[PDB]
Symmetry: C4
Subunit: 223 residues, 4 copies
Amino acid sequence: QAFWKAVTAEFLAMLIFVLLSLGSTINWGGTEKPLPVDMVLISLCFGLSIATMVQCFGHISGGHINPAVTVAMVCTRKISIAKSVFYIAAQCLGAIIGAGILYLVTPPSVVGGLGVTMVHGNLTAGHGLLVELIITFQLVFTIFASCDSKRTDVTGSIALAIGFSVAIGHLFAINYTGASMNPARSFGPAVIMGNWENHWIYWVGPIIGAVLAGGLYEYVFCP
Amino acid sequence: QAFWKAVTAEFLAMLIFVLLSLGSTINWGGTEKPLPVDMVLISLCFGLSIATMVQCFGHISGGHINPAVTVAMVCTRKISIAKSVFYIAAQCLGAIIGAGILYLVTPPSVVGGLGVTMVHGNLTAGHGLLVELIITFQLVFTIFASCDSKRTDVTGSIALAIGFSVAIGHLFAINYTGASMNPARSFGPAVIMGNWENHWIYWVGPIIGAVLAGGLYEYVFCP
Amino acid sequence: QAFWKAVTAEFLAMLIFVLLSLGSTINWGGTEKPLPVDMVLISLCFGLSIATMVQCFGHISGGHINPAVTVAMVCTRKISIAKSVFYIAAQCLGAIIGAGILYLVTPPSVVGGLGVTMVHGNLTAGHGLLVELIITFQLVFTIFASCDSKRTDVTGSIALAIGFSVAIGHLFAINYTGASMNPARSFGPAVIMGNWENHWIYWVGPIIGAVLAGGLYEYVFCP
Amino acid sequence: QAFWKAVTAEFLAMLIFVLLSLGSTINWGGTEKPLPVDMVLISLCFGLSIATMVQCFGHISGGHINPAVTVAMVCTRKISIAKSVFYIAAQCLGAIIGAGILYLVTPPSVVGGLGVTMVHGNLTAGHGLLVELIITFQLVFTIFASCDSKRTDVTGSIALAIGFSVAIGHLFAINYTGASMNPARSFGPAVIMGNWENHWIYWVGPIIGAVLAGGLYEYVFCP
């Protein structure tokens, strides 16, 4: 069954993306002498991991690797309802296992928050929701524009274009909200570490931005 | 009307480019303990944001995302006069809204200059004009060479080539003039923060470099 | 003979990859005042070196540049047994010469460990084996997915996709195990410097991950 | 005349490459409080500048942008003797003007060495020659392999492949010899600043590596 292979591919792609990207945010200086946070390190690891998984799994399941983008294909009627519920569950379970593996191999002195997205202390959760909405809007718009069959002027690697869209979201919003733009990426480490503060903005935010991006492209710009 | 969709696309592309790129230049250490400025952080965010917006909006409006490059298409008779005045206004308004959104979500202690381009204290404004002229000249030349229909040996992603041209301009001229090469990118935060020092070099500079680049390519090198 | 040219190409590609990548990990601050380790420096040098050698030598020998990936083509029956033993020996000898050249030109005060992969002090060798297994699994899967003739939706540079897969492995596992994912890359400097601690995990790890990746792609996902 | 346009293109491409890349190496901390040298900053600026100029000027003059690579096309009989002497002179004059412009706009307190390549104090000039030879060998081999008409499996941007080859040379050899791999890039600032120490290794080194790379590819690997 091609459907079972697509669900397995989504689960495996999420697991690798979460393990590699959340591992790169580990502060190896520890709580004693924390090292300065390398923003280029985190931004490229997240962005290129997405570009790697889309290259690896694009032709098997579509390479959504995101619950927010999965919801957008339902609002645009590109995938079925039955496919979405299995896609989202696989993404959520892949992040839980991926974060769980990272917690097992990471030394206890450098675990820290295990990459849990948090709103800045001086940032209101209302401002946090807006930041996550926009960064996901630019990501979903890029995916829709990069995968439009009617287009002809599309050049280069589609996966690399999607990855850099993720990278610029991190280069902006790491110190605002953590630059999640992926409900599964935030759900994974939150389950493992039990940090549940302002978690709803990481579901409401990316999903609203995804639906707005998909609807604008499919029904306004290129109908 | 396809014209209204092109004007809207230019406004939206500018808004995302300004918000994400100017947000990355925020010094989160504040005025108390400023952190060292990460030049790779700013350069890639600006460059890849342009590569993202050209990928997103190239087939809708042409993806100018710059008043300077818009003027070049008029001098080369690639766009009409009526299209340019609506393009420039949309770019200017998109940067104002994009910078205004950033000012709303940025904590007051880390706002700083809000990404306003400034000439170096030891740099004469005459030297500042020359620096901006050249970095815009290499950007417009790349765009013209990447979008030449008569060429055959063009390979790879056109948007990624345009983005790296922006990135190398930042890797050079951040500490000279701020590496603007975009009159709208400088006009936006200047309106919000009311910093208007040496603002004319960010219009005269990029425009002269753009016109020189477009004329040299279209009428001297590849007529 | 085309076979002799392929063996020579593998030897030369490994030599350049080892010399350039291991040179970038040299801490020029020395043992007196060590400089902070630049992770982006090491990650991109390793990743782009692979993308450079695949571009240079892909059409001559296939551009394996890795004993682990060479074993995967045998388990998938893409290369012959006789070709593999000559490929692995050339890779091992290329890394020894490449590391030997680096040791000759590097000043004695900054030689340090000469890029020998080591397990973290707080990391158990069992955890070290798991980390190396996964990072090689994502690398071999990318290579197999990027070089599948049956695929049609493959876009962009194949070599650049393979390089970024290496880069994200380094951005994750430099402080865990050294992010080897290449038995030859670890065998080379180990011979020169005589550091042989936990060396078996750099052969058992990458090979098991390579075989699992090749078998899953060729016999489960895309049979 | 197409010949005059090719010579002008080589002069202009060299001028932009030298000005932007040498500007990025300026230590803005000055001699009072020097800032730590950002290696990723210098490596990407040099590499992406080459990728930008090849994209800009590849179809006009071939985009050599290097005296060493120009000599390789003569040894391989890809260009004529008369074309080479005009190409090399344009490259040398472009670097002199490009470095001269940079010296004019750079504040006197941060000029420093103006990007002059120097051998490390603990490095023997004999070791310096070897380092420059190899990094140019991998650059010329990439150019020859990326521009082989007989090849079919070439994918992605050719200019981006050439740029990353330059970038990995810098990520290795900045602290060894300065990572010149371009006789013009070293000749330019040397004339302006009058620093002439071990200058011969920056001509003998890159040229020997270029000739070895071109001969091996054209007459041994792919005859």
